[PDB]
Amino acid sequence: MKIGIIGAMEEEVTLLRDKIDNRQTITLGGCEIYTGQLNGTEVALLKSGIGKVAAALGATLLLEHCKPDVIINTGSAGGLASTLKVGDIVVSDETRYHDADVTAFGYEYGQLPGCPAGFKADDKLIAAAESCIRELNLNAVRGLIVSGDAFINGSVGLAKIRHNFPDAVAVEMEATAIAHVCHNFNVPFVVVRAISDVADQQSHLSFDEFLAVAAKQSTLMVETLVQKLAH
């Protein structure tokens, strides 16, 4: 069993990286991949950099070089669901691009030609993540997570998402891209992220203040999930 884990930023992967035993590092395509064992379980941890293309590049490299059985996307997120506070957990049941528009040719809003309109997360990974949430006593919401190449900061950017995707529970910049690569390679995928801000006009300030907390809570989740999936 080899678990793939992808995060965008140094702050989002640094805690997991430290826990890796027999840590070997691969540097390529502007990405770093840390391989070794996390509490006995073989893992490959990718630091991808930010945005859709960075994530797609990273995911493709991870899949080709390390051949993980599943991928977990971790990190921060902007919370959309009203019951989410900073530090709470979001789990994807589905991912969609909020910034894709080929509606001129009759595709669904968010849907790219040749792709499904959304990417369903793996049911077994979701069930496992829910068990982790219960074990860790955390507040969490499971639902649609939407991705774009924008940091959402209130105003019209936020309103447009809430309008087009009223059931979206969180927004970020990589998950859907990773879900797309995984789809094309038939690899099970789940997003397990923690809230750093609520994507409003103070989101940049909240992000700066609470990125560390979001990394700590998503790390707790991911460490627990790795262990549950090994068994």
Ligand X SMILES: Nc1ncnc2c(CN3C[C@H](CSCCOCCO)[C@@H](O)C3)c[nH]c12
Compute the distance between CA of residue 169 and CA of residue 7 in angstroms, rounded to an integer: 19
Kindly tell me the sign of the dihedral angle through the C-alpha atoms of 17, 18, 24, 29.
positive
62 near a second copy, rule: CB under 8 A: no
Is residue 205 near ligand X by the rule CB under 6 A?
Answer: no
Tell which residue, 150, 144, 91, has the closest CA to residue 117.
Answer: 144
Q: Identify which range of 13-21, 29-37, 80-88, 127-135 contacts a second copy by CB under 8 A.
A: 29-37
Q: Is 93 a catalytic residue?
A: no
| Residue closer to a second copy, measured from CB, 41 or 60 | 60
Residue 139 φ/ψ region, left for φ over 0, alpha for ψ in the -120 to 50 degree band, beta for the rest: beta
Instruction: List, in sequence order, every residue forming a beta bridge with 21; answer none if it has no partner.
Output: 37
> Other C-beta atoms within 10 Å of 207: how many?
18
Catalytic residue among 12, 32, 88, 122: 12
Q: With respect to a second copy, which residue has the nearer C-beta, 34 or 97?
A: 97
Of 41, 153, 164, 227, which one interacts with a second copy (CB under 8 A)? 153
Partner from ligand X, a second copy, none contacting 230, C-beta within 5 to 8 A by type: none
Site for a second copy in 176-215 (CB under 8 A): 176-177, 180-181, 183-185, 203-204
- The nearest distance, CB 198 to a second copy, in angstroms, is 14
Q: Which two tokens stand for residue 61?
A: 């490299």
CA-CA distance, 101 to 215, in Å (whole number)?
32
Residue from 16, 46, 90, 97 touching a second copy (CB under 8 A): that is 97
Which one of 112, 213, 220, 230 is in contact with a second copy (CB under 8 A)? 112
Residue 83: its H or E element? none
| CA 175 and chain centroid, separation | 4
Does the footprint of a second copy cover residue 163 (CB under 8 A)? no
Catalytic (active site) residue 135: no
- Give yes or no for residue 50 binding ligand X (CB under 6 A): yes
H or E element in which residue 193 lies? strand 189-197
Question: What's the longest Cα–Cα distance across the chain?
Answer: 52
Residue 222, C-beta contacts closer than 8 angstroms, at least 6 positions apart: 5, 16, 72, 74, 192
**Binders in 87-106 for ligand X, by CB under 6 A:** 102, 105
> Hey, which residues between 53 and 92 contact ligand X (CB under 6 A)?
75-78
Catalytic residues: 12, 197
Q: Which residues bind ligand X (CB under 6 A)?
A: 8-9, 50, 75-78, 102, 105, 113, 151-152, 171-174, 196-197, 199, 203, 207-208
